[PDB]
Design a protein around this ligand. Structure first.
Ligand SMILES: [Zn+2]
Ligand SMILES: [Zn+2]
Lengths: 706, 705
């Protein structure tokens, strides 16, 4: 004792050398200052009363932090006042807990006692037990007795044996519950609670931590709900594994399932850009890598691995894990061991077996502010998932360029619907029209039905990442009745251009004449269009009536035809040009510029623009586009350059289900992108375009012609 | 070298430049770039095109290269740099004599190398510094060819051949006399120096000496505003540097009670968190790292030794590549940096500081304090905004209540050639675009510059104490039969987390009127206290003229007797605006509007407004509280104090006096009382909710039980 997240050996190293590292010491001092201010108010442990961001919810949260913090500071400073505060808090908890029935303010959510929902109960336990672990050696037997029989054992019982619908769950709720009961298990030397936590109530292994490790991540370490949920999962996964390693190294917890726990941490990093997680599915955009779960998880992974590329990420976090593992990060950074993070292009297979679609992340360029394309070809992700199959995002120059809205929610802001998911979360954020992907007949994928959406995943047709270019291709055959669409996205290295270009090819076939809309949510200020807007007559009307369209205002229409069109915007010091053609047998084709804010009486939606390509009355359509970063605007030194697009035009020709795209560059050269949709790498292909024939090996080829 | 850099300077730089990392990095970066530009040979094309075209951009690169080559030659000794500078100047000597006015000569006084003579003077101010640095490694016949081919001809053209520009009391005159004046010092030509200091007569009625008396107010304020002030700062401070280096006996940096030092300190005082207050025509991305202020800060540091400027120097993260700049880098390396002292100041406007004023009110530690800007200034001519008594608020490192600046995309060709756009007049200038009063949907002075030029607001009061701060000012000429008066306070309430803004704008008209008072806020709405009427799924254009045709009406809501509230979030902080209008009229509404109407070219940014409207009225008092509060942390997932601490806001008018009561949620209140009488001994009496408030002076603020 302590022998959990921190060992005795760890506290010795901490005590010996913590004052020697500026950042670690600053952060440890901050936590100390703040706890001291909290101690100054005495032992305040009220009766459970409120939910959400209500008083007793928050107080009981402050308390479990103090219990862990005081335990830790007592170990580290040797100072007695920290022991007696943690002790006194725990005793007040011991002499209140056995009297508690279910919380007065429960929901349909599996109730708690201390808290409105048992999730928070389990978090209270995961934190508190660490404080107790740090405090046991300084306690008399009748004190321990009151604590263990009063709070811990009854709480472990409640979250396990009395709550099987939760403790047995193959869900995050389950992970927090087993982590809490299992960690309690270790501190108390209670084999039952460990076995229960590892193998489920019946100890069959049909539930429990091990099954969670098998089921909640894909083999690559991807969590189906997305990064925003993935970083939350990480805390109970990593902390319990730490506990397991600290007490039963012979289980080889960090080796289990080809290092699934290592891969889950790296994957969490690989799902961020410039400090923030890709806001796909239900996600808030300000959640980033300095999040407490990833701070701890990184220290732990560094500690296991000695990977010095993690020191880079740890610096970008600018926040360190106040633990043994964290000290090792602080030490290593001090010694100048930091190597640059290797951002890889990766295919994250979705589902327990990584076969239910995939998320692709394509990376190109040096440092943190490189170019990243995300192709969201994933399964639904259940209730939190968005209706956006084949959606994409693009990041460049430290910014989001082509965007995902995330969730409609303001965390712990009471006046914003108690800080809950807003009505506009279903009404807008989830809807296909809010995403950069195909909308057929103004209806969401799977008609907005989560039950239908749960049944299906996209089909990944190809993934490739070389020095020449990078590709992801996927098919959606189930989003709408008698409709199939295919999207391929490429990042291309064109040596004559300053930055790589995105090439997008989206094919749709319908059985019946339909409207096909393809949005692009861009970030930045419009410079000019190549098309000519129709006068809006000094009014903007709601765009359409259902499935998200009721939140958009129509600002302008503009007619479009055979030749590619262009939009160019600036964002900070760079311009982005979007050049698009749509091959279709139909002759009704428009561009709609729209703006978020319709049916938003509560000002819940933020300001946003979109450019929507519309095709009416079509059975077929190939949406093609190039997105090109270019130029330099320096408002400080008062220079501009490269402000005009270097893409003269874009042409598309299709033959025998094969696609060819020619990007005509202004310097007279051109880029040719060719897609066969055939996986055989040796198969040869031939396409008669307008004027010329093109030929290649494989699913795809990209060549630059002078 | 005896102009901007001296012989001793170059020795200091040569000896030590390598040992100062940031200086070295920037010097190397400068060197790396000039190297790459050299590689492309000596391009000196015939004058052809204008601002943003090829030839215009080429000659700009040249004068910068000439200065930079010259400087690096001196610092490194590498003749490579001398050769390039020599040859560029030699081609200029071979071409300039056989040149009439530029092929794109406008009604705008023309140049020969450039479409206007301004760019010519800038050329010469840069090019003559490079020549000054190259003299050593030159032979008499080259010097003769250089001086006779470009410098002397150019100097004749910019002065004696162009009296209208040269005797102008305007930035155009400052550049021209800086050019010719420094050409005069390098070439040892006494005629050219005197002509630049004292005008073509030598009488003193024009030239640099008048410019120093006329173009700044005694506080060091330039009337067109911070954006124009930063740019003016260059030729003023560079010529003064040349003056000081050659003729220290003129005591140029002492002149007019250190006018030049004051203009540099004032430029810094017109900025927040790195950026200049975007009042009048201004780009919002223009900040303290502009080349003009980097040099001027360095020069002023070398003269003053004020270690306080080293704090600013760090915020600029860009050091002047000169000897003065070297002294800053050394000072910083020694750990001499002191925190800059941000004072609340009254900046009198006009030559004499009497034509209105610009108040800046500051409060808090560090750079990200709270700053209130009250724009009670004169017009500032054609770049001026029709926005008398406008205001701005900055807090927590952000702009909270905002000014649009200009509609313009600098050097972006596909945005009207980088020119001021049609919406600059139609929107950016209009009163409706600003946080101040609009009578009958019409702009101040009916949107007429000539009339606006005739008048300035009257400053009633300025005060700044530990207790509160105030600026109050009267506008009597904005419209026929209308008179208005605004007072802005920052009030320290010890029980509150942050200072508080209190605002009182009285209006008075002959005829029954519409009174609009916009608030352009930055952030996301949390909630309102009032109830919006359903917009029925259309937004229409808000009005037909004077900026109104640019806004969309998103919602109306009705209001009356009681105060209302709008709360919004910006980064980690909440802002609550509580408001009440005392008027005889019973027809008050609040409008939420959005920018973007009549903007087919997408020249305007996305922007929301809260507009307080009062129809059929002859009197109105609009009263506000802007309250910053709380903490939102998305990283740690905690929120605190998201709810306003202001229960309500009540206002009462007596015998042309005003009492404002702000009731706090905790049962306490704050009383603000305004007499409008300057005499500090005069006692005053108002009755509230039949409670009597008595105080002395122009104003009083009490925090009660
Ligand atoms: Zn989404
Ligand atoms: Zn303005």
């Amino acid at each position: 004792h302590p022998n959990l997240i921190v060992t005795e050996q760890d506290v010795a190293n901490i005590a010996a050398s913590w004052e020697s590292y500026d950042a670690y010491a600053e952060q440890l001092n901050a936590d100390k200052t703040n706890l001291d201010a909290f101690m100054a108010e005495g032992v305040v442990v009220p009766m459970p009363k409120d939910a959400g961001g209500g008083y007793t919810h928050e107080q009981h949260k402050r308390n479990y932090k103090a219990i862990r913090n005081a335990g830790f500071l007592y170990q580290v400073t040797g100072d007695e006042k920290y022991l007696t505060f943690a002790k006194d808090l725990l005793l007040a908890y011991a002499k209140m807990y056995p009297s508690l029935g279910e919380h007065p303010n429960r929901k349909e959510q599996s109730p708690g006692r201390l808290f409105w929902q048992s999730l928070n109960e389990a978090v209270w336990l995961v934190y508190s037990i660490q404080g107790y672990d740090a405090i046991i050696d300084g306690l008399a037997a009748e004190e321990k007795q009151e604590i263990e029989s009063g709070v811990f054992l009854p709480m472990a019982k409640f979250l396990s044996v009395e709550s099987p619908e939760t403790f047995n769950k193959i869900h995050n709720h389950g992970t927090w519950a087993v982590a809490a009961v299992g960690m309690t298990g270790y501190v108390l030397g209670n084999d039952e609670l460990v076995e229960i936590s590892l193998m489920g109530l019946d100890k069959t292994g049909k539930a429990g931590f091990m099954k969670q490790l098998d089921k909640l991540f894909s083999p690559d370490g991807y969590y189906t709900e997305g990064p925003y949920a993935q970083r939350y999962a990480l805390m109970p996964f990593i902390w319990f594994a730490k506990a397991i390693e600290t007490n039963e190294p012979e289980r080889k917890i960090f080796e289990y399932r080809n290092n699934i726990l290592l891969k889950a941490v790296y994957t969490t990093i690989d799902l961020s850009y410039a400090g923030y997680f890709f806001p796909i599915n239900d996600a808030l955009k300000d959640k980033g890598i300095d999040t407490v779960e990833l701070v701890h998880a990184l220290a732990i992974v560094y500690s296991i691995t000695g990977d010095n590329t993690l020191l880079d990420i740890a610096q970008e976090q600018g926040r360190i894990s106040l633990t043994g593992d964290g000290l090792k990060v602080a030490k290593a950074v001090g010694e100048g061991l930091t190597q640059p993070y290797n951002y890889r292009s990766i295919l994250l297979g979705d589902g327990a077996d990584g076969d239910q679609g995939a998320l692709s992340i394509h990376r190109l360029g040096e440092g943190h502010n490189h170019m990243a394309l995300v192709a969201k070809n994933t399964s639904q992700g259940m209730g939190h998932g968005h209706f956006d199959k084949l959606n994409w995002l693009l990041y460049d120059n430290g910014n989001e360029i082509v965007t995902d809205y995330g969730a409609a929610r303001y965390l712990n802001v009471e006046a914003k619907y108690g800080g809950h998911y807003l009505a506009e979360n279903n009404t807008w954020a989830k809807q296909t029209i809010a995403h950069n992907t195909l909308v057929v007949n103004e209806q969401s994928h799977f008609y907005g039905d989560v039950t239908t959406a749960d049944l299906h995943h996209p089909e990944v047709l190809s993934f490739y990442s070389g020095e020449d270019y990078q590709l992801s291709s996927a098919k959606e055959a189930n989003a709408y009745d008698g409709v199939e669409f295919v999207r391929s996205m490429l990042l291309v290295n064109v040596p004559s251009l300053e930055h790589p270009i995105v090439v997008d090819v989206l094919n749709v076939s319908a059985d019946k004449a339909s409207t096909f809309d393809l949005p692009l949510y861009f970030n930045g200020q419009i410079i000019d269009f190549s098309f000519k807007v129709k006068d809006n007559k000094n009014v903007m009307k709601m765009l359409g009536k259902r499935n998200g369209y009721q939140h958009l205002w129509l600002r302008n229409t503009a007619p479009v035809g055979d030749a590619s069109e262009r939009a160019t915007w600036i964002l900070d010091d760079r311009f982005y040009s979007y050049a698009f053609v749509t091959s279709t047998p139909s002759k009704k084709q428009n561009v709609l510029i729209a703006e978020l804010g319709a049916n938003d009486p509560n000002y819940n939606l933020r300001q946003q623009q979109v450019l929507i390509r519309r095709v009416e009355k079509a059975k077929q359509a190939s949406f093609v586009s190039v997105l090109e970063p270019h130029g330099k605007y320096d408002g400080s030194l008062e220079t501009t350059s490269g402000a005009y697009s270097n893409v003269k035009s874009v042409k598309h020709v299709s033959e025998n289900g094969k696609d060819v795209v020619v990007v005509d560059l202004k310097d007279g050269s051109n880029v040719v992108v060719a897609l066969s949709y055939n996986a055989n790498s040796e198969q040869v292909h031939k396409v008669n375009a307008g004027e010329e024939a093109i030929e290649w090996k494989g699913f795809s080829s990209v060549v630059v012609r002078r």
